[PDB]
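ugh ok so i messed up the first submission bc i forgot one of the chains. this is the corrected input, ALL of the components this time, i swear. 786 residues overall. if the numbers dont match what u have on ur side tell me asap before i send this to the collaborators (the ones from the other lab, u know who)
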Amino acid sequence: KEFKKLQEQRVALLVIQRNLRKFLTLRNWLWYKLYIKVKPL
Amino acid sequence: KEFKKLQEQRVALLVIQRNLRKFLTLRNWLWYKLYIKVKPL
Amino acid sequence: MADLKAAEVEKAREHFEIYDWEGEGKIDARDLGDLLRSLDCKPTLAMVKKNGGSDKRGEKKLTLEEFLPIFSQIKKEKEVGTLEDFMEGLKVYDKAENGTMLAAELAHVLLSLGERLTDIECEEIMRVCDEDDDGFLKYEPFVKTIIAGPFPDEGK
Amino acid sequence: MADLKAAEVEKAREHFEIYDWEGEGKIDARDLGDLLRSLDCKPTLAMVKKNGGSDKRGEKKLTLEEFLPIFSQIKKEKEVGTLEDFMEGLKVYDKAENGTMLAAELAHVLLSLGERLTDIECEEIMRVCDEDDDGFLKYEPFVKTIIAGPFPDEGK
Amino acid sequence: MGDEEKKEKKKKSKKKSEEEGGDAAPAPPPPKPPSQKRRAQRSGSNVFAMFTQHQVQEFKEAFQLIDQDKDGFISKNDIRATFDSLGRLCTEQELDSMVAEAPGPINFTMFLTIFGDRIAGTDEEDVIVNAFNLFDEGEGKCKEETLKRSLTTWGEKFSQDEVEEALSEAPIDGNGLIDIKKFAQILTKGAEEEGA
Amino acid sequence: MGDEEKKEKKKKSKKKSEEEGGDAAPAPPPPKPPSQKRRAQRSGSNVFAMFTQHQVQEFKEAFQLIDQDKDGFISKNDIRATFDSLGRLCTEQELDSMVAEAPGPINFTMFLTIFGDRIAGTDEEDVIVNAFNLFDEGEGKCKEETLKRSLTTWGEKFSQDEVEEALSEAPIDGNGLIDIKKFAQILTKGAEEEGA
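and heres the new structure output, hopefully the right one now
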C-alpha cells in the first residue's frame, strides 16, 4: 500500500538525476536565472 | 430547449462572432495598459 | 389570422435565425415543426409530417427559400391565440389560492386531454422542479417564459 | 497464484527502478520483500531463508535476474493466497466451534506465541469481527478480509 | 434567414457598433428585434488623467497614425481609417471603435478624453455574465479557446489571422479571458506584439 | 513629433533601433511605433513555461526604451554586479560565464530572443519542482540515505558532507529529504539570482 508512494517515485528519480547534472551545467552557463528579489533592473 | 445546439447557443455565438471578426483589435485599445503579467512583456 | 404581410416575413426570418447555429442559413427538416408553432399557425404533428418534417433526427437541410412556399399555404385557417386565455385557464388549478401548480399535476391534466401529451413532454413540464418534493410552479412566470422563448436574443 | 505469470515479470521490471535511488536497478533487501508482497507472495522470515531472499534490511541484496528463482520457490510452497494454518491456525481455548474464540485470548496469544507483531494489529483481529457481551469474538473474518486485499492481484 | 440572406445582413446589420467595414463584411445577423445592440456596444463614462503615469509613453506609441502633423489637428476620418489597420494591432474594422474613443482629432491636449473615452468606447464596462456564457450550453465561463474553436467550425466566417494572433498575445490568467474581462478589458488585460 | 516622431526616436535610442527597424515605415524595431517602452515589442520573444513565469529582463526576453527617455541599456557588467552581492556566490569564473553567453557587455535585439526561447538546462519552474510531488510523504521526498551511496559509488562524486551541502538543504521528513527544497537550489529560489 506504501509501495504506491514509491511507485510514483520511479519516474521522479529520473528527473532528479538530470537535474543534478544541470546544477553544475548552468554554473558555467549562468544568466539563466533571475527571479524577484531586490537585485533586478 | 432540448435540440442541444439550437437552444441559447445561437445568441451567444453571434456576439462571440462580433468579437471574433476583430479579435486582434478589440482585445486592446488606444492605450496598452498591460504591463503586469504578459508572456514576454 | 393574417395573409402574406411584411410582419409575418419578419416573424419567420427571426425564428429561423434562432434555429440555425452554423451561420450557413440552413436549418434541418424537423425545425419546420416548431417554426410554424412559434409563428402561431397552431399546427399538429400531422401538419408537420405533411410538410416532410420530422420528430426524429434530420435527413436534409432547408433554406428559407424552401420553407416560405410551404408557409404561405400554412397561414390559411389559424388563430394567433390570445395570451390572457392561458392565464384564465391555468388559474383554475390552485394550491395556495395564488395560481400555484404542482408539476406532476400540471403534466397529468394535459396528458389526459386533447391530442394527448407524450412521455417526453410531461417530463419537460415536470423538468423545472424534477425529483425532489414535487414541486410548485406559478402560472404567470410559467406561461411567460414559454411564449417569450428562452433567449430569442437579449441585450444582457 | 501457484506459478509465475508473464505480467509479474513485466511488473518487476518497472518496480526495479524504484528500489535503486537513481532510477536504475538493484533491489534493496527490505524492498526485496516489498516486491514479493506486490506480486502476491508473502512468506515468513523462516520461508524467506528457504527461498534464499530477503524481506528486511541488512539481509542479502540481489538484482532482478536473481530475484526469479527466489520468487519461484514461494509459488511452489505456501503463501500466495493459499489456506492452511491462517484461520485454521487460531482457536484452542474453545472446544466449541461457533466460529468464535475469547477476546482476551485473541490479542495476547499473538503476542505470547507467533513471530510477534504490533499491539495495533492485535487490535485489528478484534476489530474486523463482531462483538457481543457473551465473550464470543469471531477469528475467521479478519483472514478473509486479507483475501479481499488492497489488491487481490498484482500491486501497483 | 436563408443561405444568401445571412451574407447580406452582415453588411446590412450593421447595428452600432457593428457598422464597420469588416474582414469580409462585419458581424453575423442579430435576430430581427434590436435588443442585442447593447452587446454590440457598451459604453461607460470615467475619465482618467493624462501625465499621471509613466506608462503615459503609450500615447506617443499610438501618435503617428492619429497625428500625421507634429502638433496634430489633422483630418477627422484619419483616426477612423489608418489606425484600423496596424494601430492596436492589424486588420481593419476599427471604424466605430475609433469614432467612440476619439470625439474629434486626437492630440496630447485632447488625450484626457480619449483615455477617458477608452472606458466608453465599444464593449467597455456594463459587465454581464450571460453574453458569451450561454455558448457551451451555459456550462462554465466562455473564454478565448472556445471562440477560436467556433470561428473554424460554426458561425459566420472571418479572417483567421486575427484569432491566432489574439490567443498568442493573451496575458494568461489560466482560464483565459472570460466574458467579464472581454468587456472590462480597459481595466487590466490588453495585448502583445506589433503596433500600435 | 508627428509622423517624424518615429524618425527622431531612432536618434534617441539606437542600441536596437539601428539594428532592427520598422516593416511598415522606418521606425524603431516595431513596424511603426515611435515609443513602446521596455516591451518585447514586435512578435514574441518568450511564451513563458520554460524557466520563468513572473520575471522579465531587458535582455532576458525584451528590449530597452526606444523612447525619448534615452537608452535603458542593462549591461552584462550589471550581472557581474549581482554575483558580487545577493545572488549566486562571488566567483570569478561566473564573470567568465558572462563572456561565455556573449563577450563583455553587449547590445541586444536577437540575444534577448535566444535566451527568451532557451529551454536548455533545467526546464519550467513547476515542471522541475514536481517529480516527487505526485505522491506525498513529508511534502514529497526522495529517500536521502539511498541516493547518497548512489552518488559516490557511481554517478556524480559528492562526499558524505557534500550530499548535505550540494544535494540537500531540507531535513529528513517522510523518510527522505524534501524534494521541493532540493529542486529549489538547482532552479529558482536558491539558484537565483544569475542577474541582471
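quick check: The CA atoms of residues 6 and 34 of chain B lie 37 Å apart. that seems consistent at least. DSSP finds two helices and no strands in chain B.
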